[PDB]
Structure formats: C-alpha cells, structure tokens
Amino acid sequence: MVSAAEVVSAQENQTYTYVRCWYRTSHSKDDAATDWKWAKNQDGSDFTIDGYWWSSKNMFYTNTSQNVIRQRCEETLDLANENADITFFAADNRYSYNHTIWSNDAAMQPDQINKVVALGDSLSDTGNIFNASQWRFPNPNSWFLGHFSNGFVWTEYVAKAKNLPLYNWAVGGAAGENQYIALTGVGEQVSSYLTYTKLAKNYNPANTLFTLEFGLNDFMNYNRSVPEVKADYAEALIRLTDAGAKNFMLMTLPDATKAPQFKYSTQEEIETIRAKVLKMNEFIKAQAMYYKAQGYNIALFDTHALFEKLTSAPEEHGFVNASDPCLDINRSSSVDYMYTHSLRSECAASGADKFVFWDVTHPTTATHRYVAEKMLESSNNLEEFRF
Ligand SMILES: CCCCC/C=C\C/C=C\C/C=C\C/C=C\CCCC(=O)O
Ligand SMILES: [Mg+2]
C-alpha cells in the first residue's frame, strides 16, 4: 500500500508535538459540552511527544504509550469528575485540528491483544467528521465532542474495560456526515486502515482486536440492496484476514426502525428496512461461523435480540423510556445537528442514563455502556481472545 522506501523516509522525519486534553465540563452526562487544556508535566512545563507525521488526515506516530499520555491529561486537568470522560489528540498549536496519536508497539511484544481497531458507522464513530466540520457538527453543546451521543460509544467502553488503546475508522450517514467527508464506506475504511498501519513500527496484525458493525447506513440512507451489503461485508473480512487479522468482535444489527426518527417515516419504508436488517443478520451469523470453523477468534453478539428486549420492556433493563429521544427533537431533519437542544421534560426528570435514545437516531451513552457490558458478559470478558 506504501513502498518500503516511503516508509523509511517518513519514519526518519522525526519531530515533536503537543497534547490537547479534552474533558466534559459538567459532572452530569445530561450535558454534552466539553473544553480542553494543553497537557503539562508535574513541574508545570509543556508535555511534548516525539515522533513522525503521516497522511495518505494526519496521524502522529510516537514511542510514548497511550497510558502515559492519558496519565499526563488526568494529572494536568486534576478534576474530581467521575464523568470527565477524558480524550486526547496531537496538536502543534491553537490553529491545529484534533490529530489521532498512534502509539508504536515494541519489537518484543507478547502474543496477546494490545489494541482495538474499529470499523463501522455512527454506532462506533468517535469524532471522524468533527475536524472536517470545523468543530461545528454535530454541535459540541448537545453532542459529545464529535460522538453522535452524550458520551462514549460501545467500542470506547470495550477498549477501557480491557485498558487498551482504540483506533477508529468508523463514520455513519444518518446525520448528513457525507456533506463533510467522502470515502465513508467499509471498503474505504479497510483501505485507510491498511495504508496507515504500513507506517506503524513493529505492527503485528495478530495482536489487534477488530470490531465491525456495518449495514445500517447503507439500508437507512442509501436504499442499498441486501446482496450488495452482504458482498461488501464479506469483502471486508476477506481483506482483513488476508492482511493478517485473527481476532474479531462481530455483531448482528439492531432493528433501526425502532428509533424515534421512524415516527415520521411511512409504514412501507419501515417494513422495507426491517426485512433487510433480518436478512443481513442471518448472513452475519453464517459469516461468523465460517471464520470460526477456519480457526479465527470470533466473538458474535446478538445486538438485535438485546435491542428487541430493551425496547419492549425498558423497565427490566434500567430504562424508563425506549421510544423518545432524550433531547427535545420532534422531527427528523439533519439541520438539527447544527444547533443546541434542551432535554425534554421526561428526560430532564429521569436523567439521560434512563433513556435508550439521545437524539432521533442515536442511543445514549448508557445504552452504549449496557451493550458493551452485555458483550463482555456473553464472551466471558472475551475468553477466546488472548489478553
Ligand atoms: C452495534 C453496537 C450498538 C450499540 C448501541 C445500541 C443499540 C442500537 C441503537 C439504536 C438503534 C439502531 C440504529 C440507529 C443508530 C445509528 C445509525 C447507524 C447508521 C448510520 O450511522 O448512518
Ligand atoms: Mg461490493
């Protein structure tokens, strides 16, 4: 994907950069607003990281571990907030965009999972559209720093439970994301992953836990046929396994037609999408069995079955409401992502942790956490994966 000569030249172009530490300003997850500070050392001097830049979206590659960078942000911010939900990025100055930091692995690494790589849509996106929108979409007062929720997504909860770095290629389409970036498809995501990892040092793909949730963007936003979505899903698994991937967290798709935005869709539109989701889920199960029979490490979670339980009896799963958004949005219009919204009366009363949905499409961070924990329980804190 990148010649060996190009890799050497890039890796030898050594420099330094600074770290932007982001945090939730409120102690409540009802408030999505965030702010940032530069990372500092204990003596008050600026914290810097050594490494090299590369772009095919600039990634900064450093020898400094994600834990060390995280620790510097925690100490700099010195918040007594359990909901601080700290994230960090590389940045040369005040004008810089939020650049992902890749921590290079050691040459003598043990045979165990040491990072999470995510592929998918808005259900896994951690801010891929936010630099492209000049930090204006989704509005950072009502959506958590480029996440289409009031906090972390399921992949971040999974990565945190295992104390692992998470590197994200996921980006959706239900919020008008394609008015900001092109190349959002799963094949474009796998291509981008393959290109950027050639620049990494001592990269062993066998030590990566891959997460993949794909198909809802295609069925909801692009009216794509079931065979073309099945073919793209099979193609992603073929390309990843041929490039050394051994470990996957696969999942069935929740019935997206249960989301508040479908209150404003016709019955014909709803039945079309629902039928496509059901056919796709049978194919996802067949694909998981196919790779499991070949000796790959596959964890399959039935998110569809869990979501049916959650929406039919929310009171049995820690929720008061599964039909309305927490935010006071009572229509389906992508322009609403540009504005600040108040919480509806019922959600302000119960708290955002008691609602399944945050906006007309996306789940709350409590729903993301519930799914992530059910996943770890199902797989016995991921038993067929070596940690
Ligand atoms: C696979 C992990 C799921 C964790 C969240 C739990 C339940 C699903 C939540 C909501 C209902 C389903 C779909 C609508 C949500 C996002 C839009 C995805 C497509 C896009 O972005 O265009
Ligand atoms: Mg195809």
| Contacts for 101 with CB less than 8 Å, ≥ 6 apart | 19, 49, 59, 60, 62, 66, 69, 88, 89, 90
Structure determination method: X-ray
In a 10 Å sphere around its CB, with 0-12 CB exposed, 13-18 middle and 19+ buried, how is residue 355 labelled? buried
Q: Is 232 annotated as a binding residue?
A: yes
Q: What is the rounded distance in angstroms from the CA atom of residue 218 to the CA atom of residue 251?
A: 16
Which residues of the chain come before a gap where C and the next N are over 2.5 Å apart? Answer: 56
Give the atom of ligand 1 at the shortest distance from the alpha carbon of 120. 21
The DSSP secondary structure of 240-263, one letter per residue, reads HHHTT--EEEEEPPP-GGGSGGGG
Contact 98, 39 (CB under 8 A): no
**Displacement of CA 77 from its chain's centroid (Å):** 24
* Joined tokens for residue 288: 């998981």
* Joined tokens for residue 329: 């949005």
Q: What is the rounded distance in angstroms from the CA atom of residue 100 to the CA atom of residue 61?
A: 9
**Displacement of CA 365 from its chain's centroid (Å):** 12
Distances (CA, A) of 338 to 137, 143, 334, 373: 6, 10, 8, 32
* Joined tokens for residue 111: 């045979």
Q: What is the resolution of this structure in A?
A: 2.0
**Pocket around ligand 1: residues whose beta carbon is below 6 Å from it?**
121-123, 154, 172-174, 213, 216-217, 220-221, 251, 254, 256, 259, 303, 307, 361-363, 367-368, 371
DSSP at 300: E
Q: What is the rounded distance in angstroms from the CA atom of residue 153 to the CA atom of residue 261?
A: 20
Q: Whose CA is nearest to atom 15 of ligand 1?
A: 362
Contact 347, 311 (CB under 8 A): no
Q: Where are the alpha helices (DSSP H) in 138-266?
A: 154-161, 186-196, 216-221, 226-242
The CA 60 to ligand 2 mean position distance, Å, reads 32
Q: What is the rounded distance in angstroms from the CA atom of residue 171 to the CA atom of residue 152?
A: 15
Contact 296, 246 (CB under 8 A): yes
Say how many Å lie between the first and final Cα of the chain, rounded.
Answer: 29
Of 103, 122, 133, 142, catalytic:
122
DSSP at 162: T
46-67 burial, b at 16+ Cβ within 10 Å, e below that, comes to: ebebebbbbeeeebbbbebebe
- Which one, of 180, 169, 300, lies nearest residue 236 by Cα? 169
Per the annotation, the verdict on 122 as an active-site residue is yes
User: Which amino acid belongs to residue 179?
Assistant: Q
- Which one, of 354, 362, 273, lies nearest residue 320 by Cα? 354
User: Which amino acid belongs to residue 306?
Assistant: L
Identify whether 138 is preceded by a cis peptide bond (ω within 30 of 0). Answer: yes
In a 10 Å sphere around its CB, with 0-12 CB exposed, 13-18 middle and 19+ buried, how is residue 9 labelled? exposed
Residue ranges covered by each domain of the chain: 1-111, 112-387
Q: Is 43 annotated as a binding residue?
A: no
Per the annotation, the verdict on 362 as an active-site residue is yes
Q: What is the rounded distance in angstroms from the CA atom of residue 354 to the CA atom of residue 320?
A: 5
Per the annotation, the verdict on 359 as an active-site residue is yes
Q: Dihedral (C-alpha) 372, 378, 380, 385: value to the nearest 10 degrees?
A: -80
User: Which amino acid belongs to residue 117?
Assistant: V
Q: Whose CA is nearest to atom 8 of ligand 1?
A: 254
User: Which amino acid belongs to residue 308?
Assistant: E
Q: What is the rounded distance in angstroms from the CA atom of residue 156 to the CA atom of residue 167?
A: 10
Beta strands in 93-178 (DSSP E): 101-103, 115-120, 166-168
Please list the residues that pair with 327 across neighbouring strands.
Answer: 343
Q: What is the rounded distance in angstroms from the CA atom of residue 133 to the CA atom of residue 70?
A: 26
| Contacts for 73 with CB less than 8 Å, ≥ 6 apart | 19, 21, 39, 86, 88
Q: Whose CA is nearest to atom 16 of ligand 1?
A: 362
Contact 19, 90 (CB under 8 A): yes
Q: What is the rounded distance in angstroms from the CA atom of residue 204 to the CA atom of residue 309?
A: 39
**Which of 361, 368, 376, 378 has most ligand 1 atoms within 8 Å of its beta carbon, as the pocket-test mutant?**
361
Q: What is the rounded distance in angstroms from the CA atom of residue 205 to the CA atom of residue 185?
A: 21
